[PDB]
Amino acid sequence: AVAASSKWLEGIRKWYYNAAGFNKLGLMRDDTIYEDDDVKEAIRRLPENLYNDRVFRIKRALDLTMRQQILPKEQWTKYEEDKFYLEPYLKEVIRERKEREEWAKK
Amino acid sequence: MLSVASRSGPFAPVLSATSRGVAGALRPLVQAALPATSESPVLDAKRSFLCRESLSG
Amino acid sequence: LSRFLGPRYRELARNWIPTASMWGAVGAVGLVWATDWRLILDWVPYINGKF
Amino acid sequence: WMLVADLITLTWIGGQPVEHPFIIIGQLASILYFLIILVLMPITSIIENNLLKW
Amino acid sequence: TATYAQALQSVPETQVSQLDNGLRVASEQSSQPTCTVGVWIDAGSRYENEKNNGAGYFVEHLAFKGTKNRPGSALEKEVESMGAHLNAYSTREHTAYYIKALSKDLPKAVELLADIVQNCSLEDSQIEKERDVILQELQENDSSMRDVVFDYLHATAFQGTPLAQSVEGPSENVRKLSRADLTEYVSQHYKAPRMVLAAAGGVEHRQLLDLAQKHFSSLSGTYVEDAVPAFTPCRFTGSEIRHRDDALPLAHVAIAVEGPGWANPDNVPLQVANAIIGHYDSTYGGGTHMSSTLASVAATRKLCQSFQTFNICYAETGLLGAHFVCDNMSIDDMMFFLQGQWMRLCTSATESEVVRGKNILRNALVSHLDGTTPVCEDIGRSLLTYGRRIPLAEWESRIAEVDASVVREVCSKYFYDQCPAVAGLGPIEQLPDYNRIRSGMFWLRF
Amino acid sequence: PQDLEFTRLPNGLVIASLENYAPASRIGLFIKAGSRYEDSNNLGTSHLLRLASSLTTKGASSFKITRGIEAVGGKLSVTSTRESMAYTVECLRDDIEILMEFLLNVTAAPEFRRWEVAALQSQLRIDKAVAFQNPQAQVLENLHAAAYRNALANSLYCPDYRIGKVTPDQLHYYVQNHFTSARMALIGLGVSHPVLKQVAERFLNMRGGLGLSGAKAKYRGGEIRDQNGDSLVHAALVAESAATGSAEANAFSVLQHVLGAGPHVKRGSNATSSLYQAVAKGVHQPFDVSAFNASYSDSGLFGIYTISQAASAGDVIKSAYDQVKAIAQGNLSNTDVQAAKNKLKAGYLMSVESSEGFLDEVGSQALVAGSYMQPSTVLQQIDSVADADVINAAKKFVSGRKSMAASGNLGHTPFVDE
Amino acid sequence: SHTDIRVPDFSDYRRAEVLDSTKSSKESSDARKGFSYLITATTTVGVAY
């Protein structure tokens, strides 16, 4: 938790975002997550306008890699416009698993 | 003043958490089994048969 | 981690252990009749091994 | 690719005579094969999670 | 403020007295304007041979239809004019007749009960009209699948004995029960040492005793006919009954091992046990979160409609097991998960499961004693099974002793490598083979 | 002792506790809510509210409600009618303070989450098909639809087109407008008085007022017929009588027991039923007849109810209608009124024996009247009913506009004008 | 009716003293579930081939 040199950890978080290249396929960060059993339950709980936005963004990126292509540098997902649409729904699925586990230790 | 279940024949239905959901205040028109053959309803969604008479302690 | 330790799995390990030992001593004494371990046929001298 | 460039170094050392330089390189690269898989890989996957805000 | 311990020292005790006819008279008084009164008899279908298996159920039909002093429906008019109810029942072991009334028509109510059990007419014109009412309600009984499958479990677990036969009797006996064979049933099984006159609500024990002396003195407290029959016990058998009918929508299966009798002290740890398995129904509200494992599984996979465990005790034996209802493609998984839960209590039973199963057992027996009618039947049949009414303090000091080692030990004794009795009612082609059933009674790890 | 304590709070909440010394306890919460208070757009919202008691609330999840209550052997249950809802919890005495904080989360701060309400929509179809395996359940929903235009014609179960469509926003709106302070009653049976008071000051924070009321019920004299393949015909024929809490309402209660309103002897011939004996003169086939009587806050329905074979359903309803005509023209003996006052007084005292029948009655009186009356007061009012009031109640039935509902093979059932 | 069925006679197949119909199979329990079974205990010696 820095407060003076927080200028430094913001440049390294931007740099890793662009060194990674999921934005060049027009993806958001929560598209690229590995689906284990918690993530497959958080996807099932999304509102339908958010679910349909994610299925198309993924299909357009699997098609861009079949031809070794990149979107032009106007349709790249920006850093301050990536919406963490799945992180509120997933923090509640994990918390309900850590409660059924502390109850089995009783 | 008095209730539906005292002097009246409307319904109440009940839903539980650990016991079987039921629904009636008048329903049973008794004195209809001494005149013969009124058969118990065949279930495709099973319901209480004794309505928790088991586990009497 | 914190997935694995508690008052549950190690008391499931309490009645495990006799199972583990008789899964281990099964593997210990069972290996010696198949591959002709002559260094352990000596320890119980009642069994005439090879003629 | 540090792990691939270390199985190349262990293939060149493996056909040399057991002499002075070919044993300080043979053991400093038999260590680095195990330090990359067991230690250096799981710590760098955690720094990546922390920079993507999980 | 009070305590659950203090409140068990405040249940008023059951005062028992005895006439020179041997009749026991029991009571409980707790200041109420209504009172229950009945008689509990030690008769049933297990005291019948194959000539008169219907006879005990035939007599209960004729009991409210005419006496020597109140003929025909004059008994009906008198009970109805004061706002009183007049119930009965009948099992393999017991037989009751009782009355709810106001606690000022107790002198009239006791005179009604004493006249019923002594001087019934059993006239020839009423029994021929009563034969048709029984033959039709046998046909209504075939449509109740739970009654038919639990009758299969008694006919297969106690095959050669009097505990196999059912209360109503076969239809060939219902058709041929005479007038002579009904009165010779009354003489042998309605004697004064077998009856218990119980009462609950606002009632004096001293008033009930003089009413018992005034009305019940003409009974013979003697051994006429010199028929004291030797009670011979009934044995258990591992075997099976399978009734295949694909036109029915669902299938009913019941399975049980031998259990302890009434007086056996093993019953209290075997009811902490069956309360850990539990019950389920598809109208329940909180499945997939339930504490039971067989209930949480069967909700998530839609394996059944309902299941229940039982503990059916007798004088010398018992039945201990389960019953479930499912469709034709789910029988084999329901038997797999149930049998793996019996075996996980013979070993492996936790100290947390036993505490919940002890809390469930205390809650079940005080909830069953609410109102004058269930308290009056816990008075009348405790004096015929235990010989005394066990209070609610003696029940709780036996629940306090049970732990996981007693539960593991008592479950291994009754379950671990015994032959069960199984019953099934179609569509049951996926009900597994009896060899595969009997082999499910042993563990693989321990 | 301490027969009942009774407090009305400043926000119109009625608390009433009785301290027995029983090892078990029971707590109820009784609300003015029920099918009556839903309009034509949100039909079936009250059936879904009844099924949603063990879902996630703001203070305990759906795992902790099911596990925390089953741990001590407790129960949680909901009973509703057309005019009220009742939440009831129970356990042993020392466990009562934890099952009381769960009950105030189910009814005073629920969270209706999308995926749990959506998974719950299949339970509406299960519960309705379980209830409708009894023919009495749908004949009586039809009869309220044939007797009213609004506000008491709504069924207790959700309509079939509407299953799958009850939304989380509609459930939030039913509770926000009908589960208010001045429509509720908190009744305890093994609890002390000052602890039930300190429980109830944990939902004062809002919903302190009156709530969306129900439109007055307008009488429609209609007729709903329902041909199907059942073996027997169920038929009901009523008229409008009297609201509850009136002098005329006790006389319809006495007239109900003169005619015959249920059994007393197991396998009996109902010898003191004037309805049953009049039908059974000419009818020799299996039947059953009764007197129906329902009573609500501003109206009520009184009439008859028959069950019969299909080719005899005209003879049974006609015989059971001439007998009510014989009473209204004066043929009423004096001992028949006195034998009927006993069944109405005795049945009221046997209904209050148990811990659930007692707690039922105290909850109805706190919503309807706002007071408690001892069972000695109630027994006097029944004995003040005269022979000139049993006759003036069978006159209001005979000359009133009728309503009907039937089911089965209806080829011989009369029409309501015939 | 369902009350018209009995399990038929099995007296030609029981063990010798489990023809005893008047006991409670107690003194005759865990004492006759093995005569075709210790066959399999000395088969453990014989499957060692």
Which 3 state secondary structure label does DSSP give E24? strand
Residues after which chain G is broken (C–N above 2.5 A) are none
Q: Do chains E and D touch (3 or more CB pairs under 8 A)?
A: no
Among residues E347, F307, B21, the alpha carbon closest in space to that of C14 is found at E347
Residue E241 in contact with partner chain G when CB distance is under 8 A: yes
Active site residue E377: no
Ramachandran bin of E258, using left for φ above 0, alpha for ψ from -120 to 50, beta for the remaining angles: beta
Which H or E element spans position F28? strand F24-31
CA distance F307 to G40: 67
- Identify residue E198 by its one-letter amino acid code: A
Strands (E), F81-170: 85-92
Contact between chains at G21 and E160 (C-beta distance less than 8 A): yes
Contact between chains at A47 and F115 (C-beta distance less than 8 A): no
Residue A105 in contact with partner chain C when CB distance is under 8 A: yes
Which 3 state secondary structure label does DSSP give A74? coil
Which H or E element spans position F244? none
Residue F23: list chain E partners with CB under 8 A: 4, 7-8, 366, 392
- Measured CA to CA in angstroms, residue F54 lies from E178, E359, F50 at distances of 57, 21, 10
- Residue F349's CB: how many other CB atoms inside 10 A? 18
Burial of F322 (0-12, 13-18, 19+ CB in 10 A): exposed
Choose among E133, E144, E364: nearest Cβ to B55. Answer: E364
CA distance E436 to D35: 53
Helix E74-81 with F334-350: angle, nearest 10 deg: 60
CA distance E422 to E319: 12
- Measured CA to CA in angstroms, residue E249 lies from E242, E300, F229, G43 at distances of 16, 21, 19, 47
CA distance E161 to F265: 35
CA distance C50 to F150: 100
CA distance G42 to G33: 16
CA distance F284 to F282: 6
- R_g (Cα) of chain A, nearest Å: 17
Among residues F240, F235, F296, F290, the alpha carbon closest in space to that of F260 is found at F290
Residue F257: list chain E partners with CB under 8 A: none
Site from F353, F376, F382 to mutate, E interface, most E CB atoms within 10 angstroms:
F353
CA distance F268 to E86: 10
Provide the pairing of β-strand E195-201 with E24-27. parallel
Peptide bond before residue E427 is cis, with ω within 30 degrees of 0: yes
Choose among E159, E171, E234: nearest Cβ to G4. Answer: E171
- Identify residue A48 by its one-letter amino acid code: E
Which tokens sit at F199? 């429980």
Q: Which of residues 15-34 of G touch E (CB under 8 A)?
A: 20-25, 28, 33
Which residues fall within 8 angstroms of residue F185, CB to CB, at 6 or more apart?
A: F13, F14, F15, F16, F28, F29, F30, F31, F363, F366, F367
Contact between chains at F114 and A99 (C-beta distance less than 8 A): no
Which residues fall within 8 angstroms of residue E29, CB to CB, at 6 or more apart?
A: E12, E201, E202, E203, E204, E205
| β-sheet with F14-17: strand ranges across | B22-23, B13-16, F75-80, F85-92, F24-31, F184-188, F14-17, F5-8
Residue E102 in contact with partner chain F when CB distance is under 8 A: yes
Q: Which residues of A44-74 are buried (b: 16+ CB within 10 A; e: fewer)?
A: ebbeeeeeeebeeeeeebeebeeeeeeeeee
Residue E444 in contact with partner chain C when CB distance is under 8 A: no
Resolution of the structure, angstroms: 2.5
Contact between chains at A13 and D51 (C-beta distance less than 8 A): yes
Which 3 state secondary structure label does DSSP give F260? coil
**Closest-CA residue of chain E to F54:** E286
In E287-330, alpha helices (H): 293-300
In this structure, what DSSP letter does residue E301 have? T
Q: Identify the residue whose tokens are 């197991």.
A: F266
Which 3 state secondary structure label does DSSP give F407? strand
Q: Which residues of F192-223 are buried (b: 16+ CB within 10 A; e: fewer)?
A: ebeebeebbeebeeebeeebeebeebebeebb
CA distance E161 to E163: 5
Residue D24 in contact with partner chain A when CB distance is under 8 A: no
Q: Which of residues 7-36 of C touch E (CB under 8 A)?
A: 12, 15, 19
Contact by Cβ (8 Å): F100, F197: no
In this structure, what DSSP letter does residue E85 have? E
Which tokens sit at C46? 């009642």
CA distance E157 to E257: 9
Ramachandran bin of E115, using left for φ above 0, alpha for ψ from -120 to 50, beta for the remaining angles: alpha
